[PDB]
Amino acid sequence: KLVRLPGLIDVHVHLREPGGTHKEDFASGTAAALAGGITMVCAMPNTRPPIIDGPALALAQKLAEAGARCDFALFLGASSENAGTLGTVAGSAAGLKLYLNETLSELRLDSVVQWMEHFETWPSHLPIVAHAEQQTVAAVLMVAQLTQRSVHICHVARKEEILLIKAAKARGLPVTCEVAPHHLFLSHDDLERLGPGKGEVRPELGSRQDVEALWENMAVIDCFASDHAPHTLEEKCGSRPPPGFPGLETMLPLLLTAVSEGRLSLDDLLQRLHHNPRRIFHLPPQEDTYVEVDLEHEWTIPSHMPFSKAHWTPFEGQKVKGTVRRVVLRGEVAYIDGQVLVPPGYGQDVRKWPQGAVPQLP
C-alpha cells in the first residue's frame, strides 16, 4: 500500500537558531522536516546573529551538529560588508544567499553594485541564491549575466516572475528557481480566512491567476522548497507581524494530494524535491535513506502540526490525501506515525562529507 521515496531535500528553511529559538530551533525544525518526509535541509542565514562571517558560521555549524535530527547544510548570507571575505569558508556553506528586497538590517544591500561585488567575489563554482521579487528577478538576472554565472531564484510566487524566468531559460541563461507550497495552494481567496497578520508572507500570496500560472508553467519550476519561516502565533497576530509561514510538515501532504489528483506526476514531484535540489546545490546522496508514504489516507490539516514550534499553519482546514508513514535516515528509523525517533544531534553537516564538497578546478 505504501510507496518508497528517496530522501527528500528542502533547500529553503529558517530554523531560527541561533537567536530565535522560541520560534523554532534545530531540534524542533528538523523534527518537523522528518515528519514531512524531508531528510536534508538547507538552513537560511537570517538568524541572530546572522550567518554573515566565519565566526557566526562556526557557531551555527556546532549548534546544528548538536541539535539537528536530519542532515543539513548552512547558507552564508551576503551583507554590505562581507564581499571578498568569505572565500575561506565559502565551500563549507550550502551557498550564498542574497536578500535583495526589504529585510533584516544586517543582510540589507543598499545598491546593485553590492550585488555585483558578491557575484564577482563569491567562488564561481558555488551556489548563489537570491530572494528577488517582481522586477528584482530581472535585475539580479542582469547582474548574473554581467558576471557570467548562474543564479537560483527563491520562492517564485507571481505570473510575472515565472514568465520572466521562462523567457530567460528560453534564451539559454543559467537560472533555476524554486516555488513554495503556499504559492501553489493558497491565494488572495484565502486572505479573508487567514487575516492580515497570519496572511503576512514574503513573497505575498498571489492572485488566483498567479497560482494558475505557476501550475501551467510547472516545467519552469526546478525545485519545491517550503520557505519554512516559523513565527509564533503571538508574533503573526500582533502589531508588527513578521512575514513567513511554517511549512515543513505540510509540504509533502499538499503535493501528494496534487499528485493523486493528476495535477503533476510522482516523477515531477521527485525531480523537484530530490534530483534538482541535489544537482543545483551539489548535495550528496544519503546512504540507506528513504521515506515511506501512504497515498490513500485522507485527512484535514489541523490548527497546528505536531512538531514545529510555530504552533499554527495557514493550511488549516485543507483536505489532503497522502501521509508520511516512515522515514529511515542513514540506516536508522527516524520517524514513524507521529513520533520522531532519532535524537537531536543525529543530523550531520553534508558539506563535511567527502561526497558533499562542490567539485572545483584546482
Place this chain on the structure above:
Amino acid sequence: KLVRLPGLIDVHVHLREPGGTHKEDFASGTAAALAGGITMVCAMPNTRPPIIDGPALALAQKLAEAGARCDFALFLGASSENAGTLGTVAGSAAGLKLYLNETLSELRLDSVVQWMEHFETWPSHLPIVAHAEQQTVAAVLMVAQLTQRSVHICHVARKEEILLIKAAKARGLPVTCEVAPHHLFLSHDDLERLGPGKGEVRPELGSRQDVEALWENMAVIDCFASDHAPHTLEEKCGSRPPPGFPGLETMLPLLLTAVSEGRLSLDDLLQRLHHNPRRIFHLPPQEDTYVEVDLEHEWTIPSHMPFSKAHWTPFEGQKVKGTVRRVVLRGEVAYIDGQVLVPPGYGQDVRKWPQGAVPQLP
C-alpha cells in the same frame, strides 16, 4: 593537482554481448568505461539475440553480472511484436529503446502506430529513449504528446534537431536529449581523414554549422553519452561498414579539454555526465565511488585506446588535456593509470538495488 569527480554515468553504450563479442563484451567494454572515468553504463538492446523479450533480458542480465567490471542497467528494445508484453520485466530494465530509423531486422518498426502502441503500453513511469534523426525527432515528440508522456532523444547531432528540441522545451514539453562527443568534436571537415568506412556513423557526422549549433545550444543538452558502438577495424573498412564509433575511453578526455579551454564549465560537464543521467533514468547513487582526473596532462589520442576491442578510434591525432588517473568503485580501486584492477563480475545490475527501482504509484 588532481580533481575528484563523482562516479560518471554513460547512458548509451553498445557492449555487444550476447552475440557480437568479437567487437566487445561486457568485460572489455566496462574496462573501457572505467578507463574513461565511467562507473555506470546503460547497455543498448541491439545485441544478438536482441533484448526484445524476457528470456533474452534474463540471459543478458546474467552475462552482464558475470562480465561487467562497473555497474550497469540493461535497456529493453521495442519490436514490432512485443508491445504490451514487457510489463512484467519493464521495471528491471534501464528503459525502453525505440529504434525509429534504419536498423536491425528485429528492432525495425514499420509504422508510427507501432510507436504509439509502445508509448501506450510501456509503463508510464519508466524511461523511453528513441533513436530519432531529423524529422523523426518531431514525429516521436508528436507521439509522446498524443500519449501524454516524456521521451528522451538519443545522440542529437544536427542544428535542425537541437533547435526543434529547444522549441519543444520552450513550450514546456517533457523532452530531454543527449549528445555524443563525436558530434561535438568531429565534423564533415574530418571525413577526408577518416574515410567513408571509418567515418560511417548514425547519426552521421554533421557540418561545422551543426557542431557550432550544438555548442551554442549547450543549455538544451541534458546528457552527454558516448554511443559507444564498437566495430572492428576490419568491419569499418570492409564493403558494408556498420555505423558507429567507439568512444568510452575518449569521451571524458575530450570534454575535459573543452573545460580547460573554457568552452563549458566543470559543473556543465557534471550535470551532463552525472546528475541529469541520474534523474532522467532514475539511476541510484553509487556509494564510495569517485573518479580522480589530472587536468594538466597534455597527450595525443593514439590510433587505438588500450581497452575497447574495437582497436581503433576516430579521434586519433586530436590533442587533449585531461586524463583519468584513478577510479574507485564502491570502495575498491577499479582503475589506476592504464590498469583495470577489478575483475569481470565486480559490476552489478543497479535496477536490483532497492534504491535503483523507479518510484511508482501503487
